[PDB]
Design an enzyme around this catalytic site. Structure first.
Site, PDB file in Angstrom:
ATOM      1  N   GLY A  13       0.807  -1.213   0.000  1.00  0.00           N
ATOM      2  CA  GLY A  13       0.000   0.000   0.000  1.00  0.00           C
ATOM      3  C   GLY A  13       0.840   1.262   0.000  1.00  0.00           C
ATOM      4  N   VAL A  17       2.895  -2.625   4.039  1.00  0.00           N
ATOM      5  CA  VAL A  17       2.545  -3.927   3.482  1.00  0.00           C
ATOM      6  C   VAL A  17       1.160  -4.392   3.940  1.00  0.00           C
ATOM      7  CG1 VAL A  17       3.864  -5.223   5.254  1.00  0.00           C
ATOM      8  CG2 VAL A  17       3.480  -6.253   2.975  1.00  0.00           C
ATOM      9  N   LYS A  33      -2.972  -4.483   7.526  1.00  0.00           N
ATOM     10  CA  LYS A  33      -2.117  -3.413   7.016  1.00  0.00           C
ATOM     11  C   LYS A  33      -1.140  -3.028   8.115  1.00  0.00           C
ATOM     12  CE  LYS A  33      -2.281   0.940   4.351  1.00  0.00           C
ATOM     13  NZ  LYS A  33      -1.158   0.590   3.432  1.00  0.00           N
ATOM     14  N   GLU A  72     -11.756  -6.117   6.921  1.00  0.00           N
ATOM     15  CA  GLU A  72     -12.511  -7.150   6.240  1.00  0.00           C
ATOM     16  C   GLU A  72     -11.694  -7.512   4.958  1.00  0.00           C
ATOM     17  OE1 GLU A  72     -15.978  -5.256   4.581  1.00  0.00           O
ATOM     18  OE2 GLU A  72     -16.663  -7.106   3.596  1.00  0.00           O
ATOM     19  N   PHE A  73     -11.687  -8.801   4.592  1.00  0.00           N
ATOM     20  CA  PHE A  73     -10.985  -9.238   3.394  1.00  0.00           C
ATOM     21  C   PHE A  73     -11.973  -9.473   2.252  1.00  0.00           C
ATOM     22  CE2 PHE A  73      -9.677 -12.765   0.665  1.00  0.00           C
ATOM     23  CZ  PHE A  73      -8.467 -12.296   0.209  1.00  0.00           C
ATOM     24  N   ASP A 118      -7.976   9.625  -1.979  1.00  0.00           N
ATOM     25  CA  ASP A 118      -7.099   8.858  -2.869  1.00  0.00           C
ATOM     26  C   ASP A 118      -7.781   7.655  -3.515  1.00  0.00           C
ATOM     27  OD1 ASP A 118      -4.763   8.339  -4.350  1.00  0.00           O
ATOM     28  OD2 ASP A 118      -3.863   7.180  -2.691  1.00  0.00           O
ATOM     29  N   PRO A 121      -8.733   2.491  -8.733  1.00  0.00           N
ATOM     30  CA  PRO A 121      -9.270   1.123  -8.864  1.00  0.00           C
ATOM     31  C   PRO A 121      -8.678   0.111  -7.876  1.00  0.00           C
ATOM     32  CG  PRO A 121      -9.006   2.099 -11.025  1.00  0.00           C
ATOM     33  CD  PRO A 121      -8.368   3.054 -10.050  1.00  0.00           C
TER      34      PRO A 121
HETATM   35  O1  LIG Z   1      -6.709  -6.180  -1.881  1.00  0.00           O
HETATM   36  C1  LIG Z   1      -7.465  -7.150  -1.827  1.00  0.00           C
HETATM   37  C2  LIG Z   1      -7.634  -8.038  -3.065  1.00  0.00           C
HETATM   38  C3  LIG Z   1      -6.495  -9.036  -3.173  1.00  0.00           C
HETATM   39  C4  LIG Z   1      -6.612 -10.318  -2.637  1.00  0.00           C
HETATM   40  C5  LIG Z   1      -5.569 -11.234  -2.737  1.00  0.00           C
HETATM   41  C6  LIG Z   1      -4.415 -10.872  -3.430  1.00  0.00           C
HETATM   42  O2  LIG Z   1      -3.395 -11.772  -3.555  1.00  0.00           O
HETATM   43  C7  LIG Z   1      -2.121 -11.047  -3.617  1.00  0.00           C
HETATM   44  C8  LIG Z   1      -0.929 -11.748  -4.297  1.00  0.00           C
HETATM   45  N1  LIG Z   1      -1.144 -13.206  -4.406  1.00  0.00           N
HETATM   46  C9  LIG Z   1       0.167 -13.870  -4.416  1.00  0.00           C
HETATM   47  C10 LIG Z   1      -0.104 -15.210  -5.102  1.00  0.00           C
HETATM   48  C11 LIG Z   1      -1.281 -14.931  -6.047  1.00  0.00           C
HETATM   49  C12 LIG Z   1      -1.693 -13.485  -5.743  1.00  0.00           C
HETATM   50  C13 LIG Z   1      -4.307  -9.596  -3.988  1.00  0.00           C
HETATM   51  C14 LIG Z   1      -5.347  -8.673  -3.869  1.00  0.00           C
HETATM   52  N2  LIG Z   1      -8.227  -7.489  -0.764  1.00  0.00           N
HETATM   53  C15 LIG Z   1      -8.324  -6.790   0.396  1.00  0.00           C
HETATM   54  C16 LIG Z   1      -7.706  -5.644   0.780  1.00  0.00           C
HETATM   55  C17 LIG Z   1      -8.309  -5.330   1.945  1.00  0.00           C
HETATM   56  C18 LIG Z   1      -8.094  -4.178   2.948  1.00  0.00           C
HETATM   57  C19 LIG Z   1      -7.806  -2.748   2.430  1.00  0.00           C
HETATM   58  C20 LIG Z   1      -6.709  -3.563   3.123  1.00  0.00           C
HETATM   59  N3  LIG Z   1      -9.303  -6.203   2.182  1.00  0.00           N
HETATM   60  N4  LIG Z   1      -9.310  -7.055   1.258  1.00  0.00           N
END
Ligand SMILES: O=C(Cc1ccc(OCCN2CCCC2)cc1)Nc1cc(C2CC2)[nH]n1
Length: 278
Positions: A13, A17, A33, A72-73, A118, A121
Site C-alpha cells: 500500500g 505492506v 495493514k 474485512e478481506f 485517494d 481502482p
Molecule cells: O486487496 C485485496 C484483493 C487481493 C486479494 C488477494 C491478493 O493476492 C495477492 C498476491 N497473491 C500472491 C499469489 C497470487 C496473488 C491480492 C489482492 N483485498 C483486500 C484488501 C483489503 C483491505 C484494504 C486492506 N481487504 N481485502
C-alpha cells in the site's frame, strides 16, 4: 499480532505492506495493514464509519511504534478485475451497479464529513455477490498514482472538499467504460495538461477563482475542450451527462454523491453477479 497467521502478501500500500491473515482465535480471514496520537484518534473514529459499501475496519492495533489495521478481506480489487475484463469490457449493467454502489458509499462518508482523497481502482474491492466497497477511507487525513487526482489538488488548493472524491470516481467510471485510463499523467504537470487537453484549459468563466490558485500559471497553454462523445464512446447520453457533472472544474459546480444517485442514468440500475475466477 501473535493472534494472526500471515497467509499471503496482498500487496504494498501507500503506508505499508498488506497481508491476507487468519485470526487464530475466531478463525476469521482478514487483511492486515502494517503502517502520533492524533493518528490514533482519527483512525479510531473510522471504526464507527460503517456502511455496506465501505471495507470494514475491524480493529486498530498499536504496539512497539508499529500500527496495524485489521480489515474485512475481499478476494479481488477493481484494477485486477478491469485488467481481466480488458478483451471484452465490463458489461454496462455491472459498471452502472458498481458506480451506483460507490456513490452510495461516498454519500454516506461525505454526510459524516469524511473524505477518501485517494480513490483509485486498486482500493475498490469486489466480491462474488456483486458488491463493490471503498477501501482506505479516511487514511489520507490520518510511485503514488496521479491519474485520479482532482485539478484543485494539482493547482495547490490546501482545503479541498468532498468533490475531490467525485472527480476520482468520474475518472474511474470513464476507465471502466473505455478500458483505458482517462488521464494517465506521469508527473504533476503531465497530469494537469492531460486534463486541460481533454476538458479545455480552465479560466475564470468556467471556474471562478482558478487564476488565483497557488500553482496556477498564466503561461499554461490554452487548449479547447473536447466533446464527451469523443472521450467516452459508446456511453449513452445519460452516462455522458452524469460523467460531465462529475468532471466539472469548479468543485462547487461538481455534482455531489447524493445528487448523482438521483441522476436518470440510474433509472434502470440493477445488481448483476460479476464473472470471478479466484
Ligand atoms: O486487496 C485485496 C484483493 C487481493 C486479494 C488477494 C491478493 O493476492 C495477492 C498476491 N497473491 C500472491 C499469489 C497470487 C496473488 C491480492 C489482492 N483485498 C483486500 C484488501 C483489503 C483491505 C484494504 C486492506 N481487504 N481485502
Amino acid at each position: 499480532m501473535e493472534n494472526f497467521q500471515k497467509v499471503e502478501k496482498i500487496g504494498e500500500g501507500t503506508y505499508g505492506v498488506v497481508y491476507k491473515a487468519r485470526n487464530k482465535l475466531t478463525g476469521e480471514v482478514v487483511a492486515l495493514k502494517k503502517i502520533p496520537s492524533t493518528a490514533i484518534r482519527e483512525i479510531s473514529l473510522l471504526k464507527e464509519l460503517n456502511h455496506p459499501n465501505i471495507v470494514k475496519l475491524l480493529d486498530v492495533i498499536h504496539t512497539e511504534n508499529k500500527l496495524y489495521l485489521v480489515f474485512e478481506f475481499l478476494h479481488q480489487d477493481l484494477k485486477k478485475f478491469m485488467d481481466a475484463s480488458a478483451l471484452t469490457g465490463i458489461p454496462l449493467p455491472l459498471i452502472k451497479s458498481y458506480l451506483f454502489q460507490l456513490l452510495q458509499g461516498l454519500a454516506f462518508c461525505h454526510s459524516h464529513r469524511v473524505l477518501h482523497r485517494d480513490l483509485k481502482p486498486q482500493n475498490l474491492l469486489i466480491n462474488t455477490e456483486g458488491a463493490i466497497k471503498l477501501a482506505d477511507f479516511g487514511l489520507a487525513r490520518a510511485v503514488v498514482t496521479l491519474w485520479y487526482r482532482a485539478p484543485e489538488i494539482l493547482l495547490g488548493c490546501k482545503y479541498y472538499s468532498t468533490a475531490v472524491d467525485i472527480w476520482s470516481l468520474g475518472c474511474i467510471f470513464a476507465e471502466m467504460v473505455t478500458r483505458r485510463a482517462l488521464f494517465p499523467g506521469d508527473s504533476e504537470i503531465d497530469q494537469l495538461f492531460r486534463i486541460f487537453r481533454t476538458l479545455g484549459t480552465p479560466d475564470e468563466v468556467v471556474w471562478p477563482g482558478v487564476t488565483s490558485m497557488p500553482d496556477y500559471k498564466p503561461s499554461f497553454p490554452k487548449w479547447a475542450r473536447q466533446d464527451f462523445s469523443k472521450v467516452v464512446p459508446p456511453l449513452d447520453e445519460d452516462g455522458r451527462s452524469l460523467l460531465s457533472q462529475m468532471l466539472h472544474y469548479d468543485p462547487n459546480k461538481r455534482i455531489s454523491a447524493k445528487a448523482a444517485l438521483a441522476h436518470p442514468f440510474f433509472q434502470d440500475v440493477t445488481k448483476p453477479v460479476p464473472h470471478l475466477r479466484l
